[PDB]
Ligand binder design. Structure first.
Ligand SMILES: NCCC(O)(P(=O)(O)O)P(=O)(O)O
Ligand SMILES: NCCC(O)(P(=O)(O)O)P(=O)(O)O
Ligand SMILES: [Mg+2]
Ligand SMILES: [Mg+2]
Ligand SMILES: [Mg+2]
Ligand SMILES: [Mg+2]
Ligand SMILES: [Mg+2]
Ligand SMILES: [Mg+2]
Lengths: 338, 338
């Protein structure tokens, strides 16, 4: 059912690679592009890319869903997956991460290293190549170009706020507030992970109205915040065999949802333990932070937050879904809430 | 004269920064964006950015050069400078460079490091922000967006070929051929440094014809090749007080014009010296390579190549300038040939 939706989307990847890797001496760069694409855009759940396709099929009249229109829909879905790949290749370098999607991070691969910086930019370039190849004659062409560009700018502003609040070797507990946290996740995750795929399908369906996009945004940016909060919870308490990646938030001095909650509940003694042990590479210091989170019942605080968040997002769907089919937002809510 | 053209272009930078750095909690990210912009887009000769303005003034009828049209011209000129800044911030990381434009490389700055990866992407994002803010209602809007996107993709393919031919710790003398060299520079430099600013002004002047852009390209890509050959010559034989940067091509195992010329002229003994000493960090090995280049009269070979190249580019101007004013290409030829 959901795995069959997944299978149909994945089966289009081979064609995406062929169209992108189709001049001889430059063939070595194209062979490297193929390796970058295969290593990084394949191995995930493809939820963002699939959201484009599922939303498109639910927003466009079935008699208008011809072979070429569906081809454009899974191409844009794959552009969303490429945008995620570009950001994650770079994010893994800047966060000093080890693994991603069950394998070593592209930059950690022997023979890759900081050449991954240019590889990340190539993934970004592939989006606009695919949009030109498949959507240049469509009335929503410029809307899609501007949407991917604006989503990248917002993510990058978010990444800047994330990195500025997490300086290496500096105590930044005073800056780990709820207000700072909400602004970081709004920009670094909410815009590109949730608004982008639904907005892309909306534009392809000819739904270009400011009011409709603003209403969809009201639901989706709140869903984006939950998704990042769950990502911060899983960084420490998730199973790496399930998440496919090793957590680094504590070592990286990140303004995680966990540290924000810790500081709101900590006694003066607990604050001192957090101050002495946070943002450092020493395994025993990281372990001390985890023990403090468990002492403050942060896993239980997360489960209560997830319940309260799900009800809030469902209340936002009742308020702002119209005139779009509620199934567009309910499908996405089912996939992110566990 | 040329310094007054330069001064007028530089005086618009303060407005570019204000428009880009104009939401409070996110203010810290905006303050970082301002620091990235001031450190990296200021300190150069601004030749690419000025080329847009000079070409625009020479291609557009003076009665059509109103205040708003000129404002759009120096804004696009600054978008070209931003594109260069994005690529150079990243290139300095991947080439392990120390200095640029007379100061330490942005990534080498204490407190910056690999966060410069996101800073480079922010510079790239600023191009499309400025194009939307100043050119969205112009008929050449999409032509400019697609031109900057295509120029970035070609540069990135070029950067891939550059990095693949220069593996760290691997002997790659067999791959340092004239054919490989010509393909690397065509993509990594020629397209974005020479075709882009003239094409941008051409589109702003309403010159959008395939034939006209192809003719301009025939001159400009050849000029781009010369510029990269001079860049490779200056990497070793240039004065860092004049170039503003320290050479790393020998240490980085790069397919430089110098090593290509060395291999074409080397005796079996000289080839062995090059093989033992190229692509390594040891100062005495780098010195041994430089001595071999001087023994093979490569500085004299470069001066003869520069003379032969200047005559060839001037012959290309006589063939392909029409119907554009030859001054458009002659101005650029004067600034790059020393
Ligand atoms: N949002 C980008 C990637 C992350 O979610 P990830 O946990 O590295 O996948 P981050 O926590 O670095 O923000
Ligand atoms: N073209 C990009 C930058 C260079 O010219 P630069 O010498 O680093 O300025 P490269 O030699 O790395 O190609
Ligand atoms: Mg990360
Ligand atoms: Mg991160
Ligand atoms: Mg995370
Ligand atoms: Mg360099
Ligand atoms: Mg380089
Ligand atoms: Mg160089």
């Amino acid at each position: 059912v959901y795995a069959q939706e997944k299978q149909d989307f994945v089966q289009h990847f081979s064609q995406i690679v062929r169209v992108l890797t189709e001049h001889p001496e430059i063939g070595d760069a194209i062979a490297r592009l193929k390796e970058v694409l295969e290593y990084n855009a394949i191995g995930g759940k493809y939820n963002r890319g699939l959201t484009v396709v599922v939303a498109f099929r639910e927003l466009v009249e079935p008699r208008k869903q011809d072979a070429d229109s569906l081809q454009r829909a899974w191409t844009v879905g794959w552009c969303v997956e490429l945008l995620q790949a570009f950001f994650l290749v770079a994010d893994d370098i800047m966060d000093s991460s080890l693994t991603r999607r069950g394998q070593i991070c592209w930059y950690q691969k022997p023979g890759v290293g900081l050449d991954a910086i240019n590889d990340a930019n190539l993934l970004e370039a592939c989006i606009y190549r695919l949009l030109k190849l498949y959507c240049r004659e469509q009335p929503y062409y410029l809307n899609l170009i501007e949407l991917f560009l604006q989503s990248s700018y917002q993510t990058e502003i978010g990444q800047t706020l994330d990195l500025l609040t997490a300086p290496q070797g500096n105590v930044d507990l005073v800056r780990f507030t709820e207000k700072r946290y909400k602004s970081i996740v709004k920009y670094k995750t909410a815009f590109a992970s949730f608004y982008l795929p639904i907005a892309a399908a909306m534009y392809m369906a000819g739904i270009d109205g400011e009011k409709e996009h603003a209403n969809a945004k009201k639901i989706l940016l709140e869903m984006g915040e939950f998704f990042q909060i769950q990502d911060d919870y899983l960084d420490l308490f998730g199973d790496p065999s399930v998440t496919g990646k090793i957590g680094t938030d504590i070592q990286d001095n990140k303004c995680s949802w966990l540290v924000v909650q810790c500081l709101q509940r900590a006694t003066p003694e607990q604050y001192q333990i957090l101050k002495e042990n946070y943002g450092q590479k020493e395994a025993e210091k990281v372990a001390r932070v985890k023990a403090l989170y468990e002492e403050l019942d942060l896993p239980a605080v997360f489960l209560q937050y997830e319940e309260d968040s799900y009800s809030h997002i469902m209340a936002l769907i009742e308020q702002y879904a119209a005139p779009l089919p509620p199934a567009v937002f309910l499908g996405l809510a089912r996939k992110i809430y566990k």
